[PDB]
Design an enzyme around this catalytic site. Structure first.
Site, short mmCIF file in Angstrom:
data_model
loop_
_atom_site.label_atom_id
_atom_site.label_comp_id
_atom_site.label_asym_id
_atom_site.label_seq_id
_atom_site.Cartn_x
_atom_site.Cartn_y
_atom_site.Cartn_z
N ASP A 144 0.82 -1.20 0.00
CA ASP A 144 0.00 0.00 0.00
C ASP A 144 0.86 1.26 0.00
O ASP A 144 0.50 2.27 0.60
CB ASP A 144 -0.94 -0.01 1.21
CG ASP A 144 -2.11 0.94 1.05
OD1 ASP A 144 -2.34 1.41 -0.09
OD2 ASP A 144 -2.79 1.20 2.05
N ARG A 148 0.16 9.30 0.43
CA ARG A 148 -0.80 9.41 1.52
C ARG A 148 -0.38 8.57 2.72
O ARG A 148 -0.75 8.88 3.85
CB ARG A 148 -2.19 8.98 1.05
CG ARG A 148 -2.23 7.55 0.52
CD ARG A 148 -3.63 7.06 0.21
NE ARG A 148 -3.69 5.62 0.37
CZ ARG A 148 -3.44 4.74 -0.60
NH1 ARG A 148 -3.13 5.15 -1.82
NH2 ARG A 148 -3.51 3.44 -0.33
N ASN A 149 0.39 7.51 2.47
CA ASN A 149 0.85 6.62 3.54
C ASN A 149 2.31 6.85 3.92
O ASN A 149 2.96 5.98 4.49
CB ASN A 149 0.62 5.16 3.17
CG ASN A 149 -0.85 4.79 3.18
OD1 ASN A 149 -1.66 5.44 3.84
ND2 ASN A 149 -1.20 3.73 2.46
N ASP A 162 1.50 3.26 7.76
CA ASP A 162 0.33 2.48 7.35
C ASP A 162 0.70 1.06 6.94
O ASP A 162 0.66 0.71 5.77
CB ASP A 162 -0.42 3.17 6.22
CG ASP A 162 -1.65 3.92 6.70
OD1 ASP A 162 -1.51 5.11 7.07
OD2 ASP A 162 -2.74 3.32 6.71
#
Length: 282
Positions: A144, A148-149, A162
């Site tokens: 992932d 954003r992470n 994350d």
């Protein structure tokens, strides 16, 4: 859920604060989580009130993964956990400047924050390659990886975060994906997307999409293209164009990460080496 005393943190030494976003993460103060008397600002991940069974399983998994990964300067640090008698609290290092995506978009030139130099952007990519290199050396896949992470702290220090989808692939050749996965499509390697297999070289593909995000200053990948049309395009060899204000050398690196054949993509070790040279220049 059995107790792991090594990571167990006493609940009374922990004060919950404001939410950072919403399972849900809240800011918190942890006394002696490092200096027995010193209180420290931390981030606590926990379940929402409408949490599912999968959510609790994911939160447990995320905690366990961060244990086996270990310490590294470019990775969000696990500090402790409240697992016994009460709600599950995964206590992680706090990031003073939030996630990389909003951090970049806020630093876009006029036409809000002071815009970044090219050298800053390369440094950002270099730190994330180093973090990923360490991750892969621990035989772990992120699955992932995205802006954003990634969290930002201190003086432009990148921190991969994350790990709720992270997996241990030690002693196995690849991870087997389900048919309809929980991985965002625009960051997915084709082998995972089509052949349902995932390796470190699948993270590399994602790292390429991460690179494109960085040099577009938080732009969303495959602009104008809905995911339901992205499937066919990837099977037809579609790739993202060069972001404005980006050397060809760094764009070729993105293209290398987007090789159809996973083994033909560079390794994170090789990505670090090249980026270190590019960063030493500039």
């Amino acid at each position: 859920l059995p107790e792991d005393p090594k990571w167990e943190f006493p609940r009374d030494k922990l004060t919950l604060g404001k939410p950072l976003g919403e399972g849900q993460v809240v800011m918190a103060e942890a006394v002696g989580i490092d200096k027995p008397k010193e209180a420290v600002t931390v981030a606590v991940k926990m379940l929402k009130d409408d949490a599912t069974e999968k959510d609790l399983s994911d939160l447990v998994s995320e905690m366990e993964m961060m244990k086996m990964i270990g310490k590294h300067k470019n990775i969000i640090n696990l500090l402790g956990a409240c697992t016994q008698d009460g709600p599950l609290y995964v206590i992680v290092e706090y990031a003073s400047k939030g996630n990389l995506r909003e951090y970049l978009r806020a630093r876009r030139p006029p036409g809000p924050e002071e815009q970044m130099t090219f050298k800053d952007l390369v440094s950002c990519t270099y730190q994330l390659a180093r973090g990923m290199e360490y991750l892969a050396s621990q035989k772990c896949i992120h699955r992932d990886l995205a802006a954003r992470n990634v969290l930002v702290t201190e003086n432009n220090v990148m921190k991969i975060a994350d790990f709720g989808l992270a997996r241990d692939i030690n002693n196995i050749d690849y991870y087997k994906e389900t048919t309809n996965g929980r991985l965002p499509v625009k960051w997915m390697a084709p082998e995972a997307l089509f052949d349902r297999v995932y390796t470190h070289q699948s993270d590399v593909w994602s790292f390429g999409v991460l690179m494109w995000e960085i040099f577009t200053l938080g732009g969303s990948p495959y602009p104008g293209i809905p995911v339901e049309e992205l499937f066919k395009l990837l099977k037809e060899g579609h790739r993202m164009d060069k972001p404005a204000n980006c050397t060809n050398e760094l764009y070729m690196m993105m293209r290398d990460c987007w090789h159809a054949v996973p083994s033909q993509r560079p390794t994170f070790k090789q990505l670090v080496e090249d980026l270190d040279r590019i960063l030493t220049l500039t």
